[PDB]
Amino acid sequence: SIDVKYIGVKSAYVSYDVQKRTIYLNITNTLNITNNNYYSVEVENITAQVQFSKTVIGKARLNNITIIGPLDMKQIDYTVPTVIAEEMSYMYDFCTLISIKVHNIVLMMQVTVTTTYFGHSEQISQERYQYVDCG
Amino acid sequence: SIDVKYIGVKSAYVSYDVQKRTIYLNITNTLNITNNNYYSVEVENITAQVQFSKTVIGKARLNNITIIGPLDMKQIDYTVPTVIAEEMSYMYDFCTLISIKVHNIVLMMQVTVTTTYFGHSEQISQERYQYVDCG
Amino acid sequence: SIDVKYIGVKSAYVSYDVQKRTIYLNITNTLNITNNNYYSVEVENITAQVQFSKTVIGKARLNNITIIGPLDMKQIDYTVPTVIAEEMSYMYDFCTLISIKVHNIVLMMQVTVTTTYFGHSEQISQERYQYVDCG
Amino acid sequence: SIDVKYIGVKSAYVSYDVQKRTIYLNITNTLNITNNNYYSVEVENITAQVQFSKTVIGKARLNNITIIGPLDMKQIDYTVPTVIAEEMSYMYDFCTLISIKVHNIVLMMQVTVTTTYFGHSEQISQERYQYVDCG
Amino acid sequence: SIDVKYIGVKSAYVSYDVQKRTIYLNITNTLNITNNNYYSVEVENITAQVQFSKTVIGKARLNNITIIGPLDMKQIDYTVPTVIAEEMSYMYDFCTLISIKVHNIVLMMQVTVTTTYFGHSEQISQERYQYVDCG
Ligand SMILES: *[C@@H]1O[C@H](CO)[C@@H](O)[C@H](O)[C@H]1NC(C)=O
Ligand SMILES: *[C@@H]1O[C@H](CO)[C@@H](O)[C@H](O)[C@H]1NC(C)=O
Ligand SMILES: *[C@@H]1O[C@H](CO)[C@@H](O)[C@H](O)[C@H]1NC(C)=O
Ligand SMILES: *[C@@H]1O[C@H](CO)[C@@H](O)[C@H](O)[C@H]1NC(C)=O
Ligand SMILES: *[C@@H]1O[C@H](CO)[C@@H](O)[C@H](O)[C@H]1NC(C)=O
Ligand SMILES: *[C@@H]1O[C@H](CO)[C@@H](O)[C@H](O)[C@H]1NC(C)=O
Ligand SMILES: *[C@@H]1O[C@H](CO)[C@@H](O)[C@H](O)[C@H]1NC(C)=O
Ligand SMILES: *[C@@H]1O[C@H](CO)[C@@H](O)[C@H](O)[C@H]1NC(C)=O
Ligand SMILES: *[C@@H]1O[C@H](CO)[C@@H](O)[C@H](O)[C@H]1NC(C)=O
Ligand SMILES: *[C@@H]1O[C@H](CO)[C@@H](O)[C@H](O)[C@H]1NC(C)=O
Ligand SMILES: *[C@@H]1O[C@H](CO)[C@@H](O)[C@H](O)[C@H]1NC(C)=O
Ligand SMILES: *[C@@H]1O[C@H](CO)[C@@H](O)[C@H](O)[C@H]1NC(C)=O
Ligand SMILES: *[C@@H]1O[C@H](CO)[C@@H](O)[C@H](O)[C@H]1NC(C)=O
Ligand SMILES: *[C@@H]1O[C@H](CO)[C@@H](O)[C@H](O)[C@H]1NC(C)=O
Ligand SMILES: *[C@@H]1O[C@H](CO)[C@@H](O)[C@H](O)[C@H]1NC(C)=O
Ligand SMILES: *[C@@H]1O[C@H](CO)[C@@H](O)[C@H](O)[C@H]1NC(C)=O
Ligand SMILES: *[C@@H]1O[C@H](CO)[C@@H](O)[C@H](O)[C@H]1NC(C)=O
Ligand SMILES: *[C@@H]1O[C@H](CO)[C@@H](O)[C@H](O)[C@H]1NC(C)=O
Ligand SMILES: *[C@@H]1O[C@H](CO)[C@@H](O)[C@H](O)[C@H]1NC(C)=O
Ligand SMILES: *[C@@H]1O[C@H](CO)[C@@H](O)[C@H](O)[C@H]1NC(C)=O
Incomplete structure (x- = not known):
């Protein structure tokens, strides 16, 4: 990322910022600006690119094969009981x-089991975060 | 991302910002600006690109094969009971x-089992987040 | 993304911003601006691109084959009981x-089992988020 | 996305913004602007592109084959009972x-089992979100 | 990342910042600026690039094979009970x-089992974070 x-x-x-009751007298301002930007980004010179995968199974016996991807919660118990009893x-x-x-x-972006990737991947996050404001 | x-x-x-009761007297402002931007981004020179996958199964016995992708919750129990009893x-x-x-x-973006990817992938998130404001 | x-x-x-009871006297403003932008973005020079996949099954016995994609909740129990009893x-x-x-x-964007992708994918989200404002 | x-x-x-009871005296404003924008975006030079897939099954026995796509809820129980009893x-x-x-x-956009994609895919979301305002 | x-x-x-009731007398400001930026970033000169993987199984017996990706919670118990009893x-x-x-x-970005990656991957996060402000 060139600029974040x-x-x-x-x-x-x-x-030129004039704020909170200032006195702005005789001023002469002459501003001469030459600005040029040339962006050559992500240019790719590629003759031949090949993505190839092959799988062959022969004369095999497969029993009880388990492949489980990520992020499994299975058994989670959330118990938050609140009891309020007041006489006077x-x-x-x-x-x-x-x-x-x-x-x-x-x-x-990419959660998988088998991934073949040619390229560019970018994640950018900007925030202002205030959770609880009270009183 | 060139600019975020x-x-x-x-x-x-x-x-030129004049705010909160300032006195703006004799000013002469001369502004001369030459600005040029050239964006050459993501140009690709590609003769031959091939994505190829092949699978063959022969004379095989497969029993109890389980493939499960990601993000499984299975068994989750959420118990939040609230009891309020008041006499006086x-x-x-x-x-x-x-x-x-x-x-x-x-x-x-991409959650899968088998993924072959040629290219460019970008995720950008900007926010201002305030959860609870009271009082 | 060139500009976010x-x-x-x-x-x-x-x-030129004049706000909250300022006094704007003799001003002469001369502004001379030359601005040029050239966008060459995502130009692709491609002779031959091939996406090809082949699957063949021969003389095979397959029993109890289970493929399950992502994001399965199965069994989730949400119990939130509220009881209020008041005498006086x-x-x-x-x-x-x-x-x-x-x-x-x-x-x-893309949730699948088998995905072959040539190209460009972009996700951009901007928000201002305030949940609860009261009082 | 060039501009978001x-x-x-x-x-x-x-x-030129004059707001909240300011005094706008002698001003001469001369503005000379030359602005040119050239957009060359997503131009593709492609001789031959081929998407091809082939499947053949021969002399095979397949029993109990289950393929289930994503986003399955199965069994979810939502119990939110509210009881209010008041004497005086x-x-x-x-x-x-x-x-x-x-x-x-x-x-x-794309949720599938088998997907072959050549092209460009973009998702853009902008919002202002305020949930609950009361009092 | 060239600039963060x-x-x-x-x-x-x-x-030029004039703030909080200052006296701005005779000033002459002459500013002459020539600024040029040339960005050549991520240009790649590649003749031939090949990603290839092959798997073959023959005359093999496989029983009770378990491959489990990362981030598994299994059994987690959250117990937070609160009881308040007040007489007077x-x-x-x-x-x-x-x-x-x-x-x-x-x-x-990438959580998988088997990943082959050619390219560039970047994660950038900027935030201001205030959790609890009250009183
Ligand atoms: C500067 O401002 C004063 C006001 O106090 C004025 O009398 C004088 O002529 C001005 N001089 C120039 C050069 O603008
Ligand atoms: C402004 O800058 C340019 C540079 O491109 C220069 O040729 C020109 O003479 C300058 N003009 C003045 C009045 O300084
Ligand atoms: C790359 O582009 C140039 C022109 O910009 C062209 O002459 C050349 O043939 C291209 N590369 C290939 C492998 O064709
Ligand atoms: C496969 O696993 C199950 C339990 O998950 C078990 O009952 C069964 O006997 C196993 N298969 C073989 C061939 O042992
Ligand atoms: C500057 O402003 C004053 C007002 O106080 C005025 O008398 C004077 O003629 C002005 N001078 C020029 C050069 O504008
Ligand atoms: C304004 O800038 C241009 C640069 O392109 C220059 O040729 C010209 O002389 C400048 N004019 C003045 C009055 O400074
Ligand atoms: C790339 O583009 C140039 C012209 O911009 C063309 O002469 C050349 O033949 C292209 N590349 C191929 C492989 O055709
Ligand atoms: C497959 O698994 C089930 C339980 O999930 C089990 O009852 C069965 O015996 C297994 N198959 C074989 C051939 O053992
Ligand atoms: C500047 O403004 C004053 C008002 O106070 C006026 O008398 C004077 O003639 C003006 N000068 C010019 C050069 O506009
Ligand atoms: C305005 O800028 C242009 C640059 O294209 C220049 O040729 C011209 O002389 C400038 N005019 C003045 C009055 O400065
Ligand atoms: C690419 O475009 C140029 C003209 O812009 C053309 O001469 C050339 O033949 C194109 N490429 C192919 C492979 O045809
Ligand atoms: C397939 O699985 C079921 C239970 O899911 C089991 O009853 C059955 O015996 C299995 N098939 C074989 C051939 O064992
Ligand atoms: C500036 O405004 C004043 C009003 O106070 C006026 O007397 C004067 O003639 C004006 N000068 C010019 C140059 O417009
Ligand atoms: C306005 O700008 C143009 C640039 O295209 C220039 O040719 C012309 O001389 C300028 N006119 C003035 C009065 O500055
Ligand atoms: C297929 O599965 C069912 C239960 O889902 C089971 O009763 C049946 O026996 C299985 N088929 C074979 C051939 O075992
Ligand atoms: C400087 O400002 C004073 C105001 O106190 C003024 O009398 C004087 O003429 C100004 N001199 C110049 C060179 O602007
Ligand atoms: C402004 O800077 C440029 C450099 O490009 C130079 O050629 C020119 O003479 C400068 N002008 C002045 C008035 O200093
Ligand atoms: C690298 O780029 C140059 C031109 O920038 C080119 O002449 C050369 O052939 C390229 N390298 C290969 C291996 O083609
Ligand atoms: C790289 O690009 C140059 C032109 O920029 C071209 O002459 C050369 O053939 C390209 N490389 C290959 C391997 O084609
Ligand atoms: C596979 O594991 C299960 C328990 O997970 C067990 O009962 C079974 O006997 C194992 N298979 C063999 C062939 O021992």
């Missing part, structure tokens, strides 16, 4: 929260 | 929340 | 919520 | 909500 | 939260 940028407030090439009481609850499984950003 | 940008407030090439009480609940499974952004 | 941009408030090439009480509930399964953005 | 943009409020090339009480409920399965944006 | 940047507040080439008491709860499993940013 996270800029909180302001991005600018040339900035004063109970004030402000900003109370219970969260079990929260997923914001899930990116999965 | 997250800019919170303002993005500008040339900015005062109960004030402000901003109370229960969430079990929350998914904002799920991107899956 | 998230800009919170304002995007502008040249900005005062109960005030403001901004109370229960959510089990919430999915905002689900993008799936 | 999320701009919260304002997008403009050249902006005061119950005030403002902004109370229960949601089990909510799906905003579901995009699925 | 995290800039908290302001990024600018040339900045005063209970004030402000900014109280319980979270079991929270996942913000999950990026997985």
Whole structure:
């Protein structure tokens, strides 16, 4: 990635910024800019490219063959019980929260068993993340 | 990715910004800009490209063959019981929340068993994320 | 992706911004701009491209063959019981919520068993996300 | 994607913005702009492209062959019971909500078993998302 | 990655910044800038590239063969019970939260069993992260 940028407030090439009651008197501004950008990116010179796979099975006996890909949960037990019993009481609850499984950003590109890959793969994530603001 | 940008407030090439009761007197501004951009991106020179796969099975005995792809949950138990019993009480609940499974952004491009890939794959995610604001 | 941009408030090439009771006196502004952009993107020079697959089965015995693709849930139990019993009480509930399964953005491009792919694949997601605002 | 943009409020090339009771005196503005854009995108030079697949079965015995594609739920149980019993009480409920399965944006392009693909595939999603606003 | 940047507040080439009630008297500013950037990135000169794999099984007996990919949870038990019993008491709860499993940013590119890869792979993540702000 030639250019990746996270800029909180302001991005600018040339900035003349006059803010909060300043006095802007005699100013002469002369700006002369020559800017040229040449992008030669990902050019590929390829005569011959071959992806080839072959499988042959002969005179074989196969019994109880198990192939299981990734990300298996099988048996998971989530027990979160809450019991509140009050005879004569004063109970004030402000900003109370219970969260079990929260997923914001899930990116999965290639999950497989057998993968043959020629090329380019790029993952870019930018965020501002604030979970809980109260009071 | 040649250019990826997250800019919170303002993005500008040339900015003359006059804000919050300033006094803007005699100003002369002369701006002379020559800007040229040449993008040569992803050009491919390819004579011959071949994707080939072959499978042959002969005189074979196959019994109990199991192939299972990824992301299997099988058996999951979610138990969240809530019991509230009050005889003579005062109960004030402000901003109370229960969430079990929350998914904002799920991107899956290639999930398979057998994959042959020639090319380019790109995933880009930008967000501002605020979950809970109260009070 | 040549240009990807998230800009919170304002995007502008040249900005003359006069805001909140400023005094804008004698100004002369002369702006001379030459801007040229040449986009050569994804041009492909390809003589011969072949995608070929062949499968042959001969004199074979196959019994109990199971192929199962991804994303299987099988057995999932969601139990969220809520019981409220009040004899003589005062109960005030403001901004109370229960959510089990919430999915905002689900993008799936290629989920398969056998995939042969020549080309270009791109996923781009931009959002502003605020879940709960109350009070 | 050459240009992807999320701009919260304002997008403009050249902006003269006079807002909130400013005094706009003698101004002379001369703007001279030459802008040219040339888009050569996705041009393909292809002599011969062949997609070919062949399957032959001979003298074979196949019994109990099961192929199941992705996204199977099978057995899912959703139990959310709510019981409210009040003898002599005061119950005030403002902004109370229960949601089990909510799906905003579901995009699925290619979900299959066997896929052969030559070309270009692009998914772009932009949104502003606010779930619950009350009070 | 030629350029990766995290800039908290302001990024600018040339900045004339006048802020918080300053007095801006006689100034003459002459700026003459010649800027040229040439990007030759990821150009590949390749005559012949071959990815080839072959598997053959003959006169073999295979029984109880198990291949299991990564990320298996099997048996996990989450027990978080909460019991509150009050006879005559005063209970004030402000900014109280319980979270079991929270996942913000999950990026997985290639998780497989057998992978052959020719190319370039890049993962870039930028964020500002504030979890809990209250009071
Ligand atoms: C500078 O500004 C003052 C105002 O205080 C003015 O009297 C004077 O003529 C100005 N000079 C020039 C060169 O603009
Ligand atoms: C502006 O810059 C260019 C460079 O391309 C130069 O030829 C020209 O003389 C400059 N003009 C002034 C007034 O400085
Ligand atoms: C690569 O491109 C050039 C022209 O840009 C061409 O002359 C040459 O024949 C190409 N390569 C092959 C292997 O054809
Ligand atoms: C295959 O496995 C099962 C249990 O998973 C077992 O009962 C069976 O006997 C096995 N096959 C052979 C041929 O032993
Ligand atoms: C500068 O502004 C002042 C106002 O205070 C004016 O009297 C003067 O003529 C101006 N000078 C020029 C060169 O514009
Ligand atoms: C503006 O810039 C160009 C560069 O292309 C130059 O030829 C020209 O002389 C400049 N004009 C002035 C007034 O500086
Ligand atoms: C590539 O393109 C050039 C012209 O741009 C052409 O002369 C050449 O024959 C092409 N390559 C092949 C292998 O045909
Ligand atoms: C295949 O597996 C089942 C249980 O999954 C088992 O009952 C059966 O005997 C197995 N096949 C053979 C030939 O053993
Ligand atoms: C500048 O503005 C003042 C107003 O205060 C005016 O008297 C003067 O003639 C102006 N000068 C020019 C050069 O416009
Ligand atoms: C404006 O810019 C062009 C560049 O194409 C230049 O030829 C011309 O002389 C400039 N004019 C002025 C008044 O600066
Ligand atoms: C590619 O395009 C050029 C013209 O742009 C043409 O002369 C050439 O024959 C093309 N390539 C093939 C293999 O035909
Ligand atoms: C195939 O599997 C079933 C159970 O899934 C089992 O009852 C049967 O015996 C198996 N086939 C053979 C030939 O063993
Ligand atoms: C500038 O505006 C003032 C008003 O205060 C006026 O008297 C003066 O003639 C104007 N000058 C020009 C050059 O427009
Ligand atoms: C405007 O720009 C063009 C560039 O195409 C230039 O030829 C012309 O002289 C310019 N005119 C002025 C008044 O600057
Ligand atoms: C096929 O599977 C069923 C159960 O799914 C089983 O009853 C049957 O015996 C199997 N076929 C053979 C030939 O064993
Ligand atoms: C500088 O500013 C003063 C204002 O205090 C003014 O009297 C003077 O003429 C200015 N000089 C120049 C060269 O602009
Ligand atoms: C501006 O810079 C250029 C360099 O390209 C130079 O040729 C020109 O003479 C400079 N002009 C001035 C006024 O310094
Ligand atoms: C590498 O590129 C040059 C031109 O940039 C070319 O002359 C040469 O033949 C290429 N290498 C091979 C092995 O073809
Ligand atoms: C590489 O590209 C050059 C032109 O840029 C071309 O002359 C040469 O034939 C290419 N390489 C091969 C192996 O064809
Ligand atoms: C295969 O494993 C199972 C238990 O997983 C076992 O009962 C069986 O006897 C094994 N197969 C053989 C041939 O021993």
